[PDB]
RNA sequence: UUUUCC
């Protein structure tokens, strides 16, 4: 396709964090192009993603899309698992739009957002073995019920899990079922702490 | 063991 209109560029790019180690710009493009078409979120011929720039330190990427609306749609993939990792999809910090009718137009089945706001039933899960990737922890929690939001905390320099995560169930009543099923679980030198995150949050 | 450029 043609080059993108320059005055919509800020509205045609997204930050993508927590990318897989060793990923190429081509592999990232192919993943997003395929997911958008498989989800019915692109119907026009041709690829919705024009380019991917992976930062020199290889921890995040910026994606550029051919249209403003497809960029907004791609926000709905926040949290999608790619090679075991929860992709963190966000607006560029210098994107300042737009009040009226910037949020994804349609939801993507099975994708769980990484944005976990503090709230009544937000859970903290601590003591997790650090060999478990984002996918496996998400699966541990999804056993109890579908998730609305989830993030596993990792070291920003090594990519290794720090052994704790946060989540929110779709059904608020699943919260207590997950606590009963996981809190106090013993794993060698570690014991899971599973409780509403408000109970132990720093002040 | 309270989410990371141009």
Straight-line distance from CA A57 to C1' B6, in Å?
Answer: 15
CB A76 within 8 A of CB A110: no
DSSP state string for A25-63 = HHHHHHHHHHHHHHTTS--SSS-SEEEEEE-TTSSEEEE
Q: How determined? A: X-ray
- Rounded to whole angstroms, the Cα distance separating A32 from A42 reads 11
List Cα–Cα distances, A26 to A47, A53, A55, A75, in angstroms: 12, 10, 14, 20
CB A116 within 8 A of CB A88: no
For strand B, which residues in window 38-67 of chain A come within 7 Å by CB? 53, 55, 59-60, 62
- Rounded to whole angstroms, the Cα distance separating A170 from A149 reads 8
- Which residues does A121 contact at the CB level (< 8 Å), separation at least 6? A168, A169, A172, A175, A196
Q: Tell me which protein residue sits closest to nucleotide B2, measuring alpha carbon to C1'.
A: A201
Nucleotide nearest to A155 (CA to C1'): B4
- Tell which strand B nucleotides have any atom below 7 Å from a protein Cβ: 1-6
CB A13 within 8 A of CB A63: yes
CB A35 within 8 A of CB A66: no
Helix ranges (DSSP H) in chain A: 25-38, 68-74, 134-142, 174-182, 197-200
Residue A199 approaches strand B within 7 Å at CB: yes
Record the tokens describing residue A189, joined without a space: 């030198």
Residues linked to residue A64 through DSSP beta bridges, in sequence order: A13, A51
CB A126 within 8 A of CB A164: yes
Question: Resolution to 1 decimal, in Å?
Answer: 1.4
CATH class of A6-90: alpha beta
Record the tokens describing residue A146, joined without a space: 């579908």
CB A134 within 8 A of CB A78: no
């Amino acid at each position: 396709g043609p080059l993108g209109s320059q005055m919509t560029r800020q509205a045609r790019r997204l930050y993508v964090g927590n990318i897989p180690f060793g990923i190429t710009e081509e592999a990232m493009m192919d993943f997003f192009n395929a997911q958008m078409r498989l989800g019915g979120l692109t119907q026009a011929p041709g690829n919705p993603v024009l380019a991917v720039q992976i930062n020199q330190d290889k921890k995040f990427a910026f994606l550029e899309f051919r249209s403003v609306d497809e960029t907004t749609q791609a926000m709905a993939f926040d949290g999608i698992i790619f090679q075991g990792q929860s992709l963190k999809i966000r607006r560029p910090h210098d994107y300042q739009p737009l009040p009226g009718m910037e949020n994804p137009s349609v939801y993507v089945p099975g994708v769980v957002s990484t944005v976990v706001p503090d709230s009544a039933h937000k859970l903290f899960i601590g003591g997790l073995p650090n060999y478990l990737n984002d996918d496996q922890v998400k699966e541990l929690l999804t056993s109890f019920g579908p998730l609305k939001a989830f993030n596993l905390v990792k070291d920003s320099a090594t990519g290794l899990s720090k052994g704790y995560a946060f989540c929110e169930y779709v059904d608020i009543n699943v919260t207590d079922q997950a606590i009963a099923g996981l809190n106090g679980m013993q794993l060698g030198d570690k014991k899971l702490l599973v409780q509403r995150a408000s109970v132990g949050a720093k002040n």
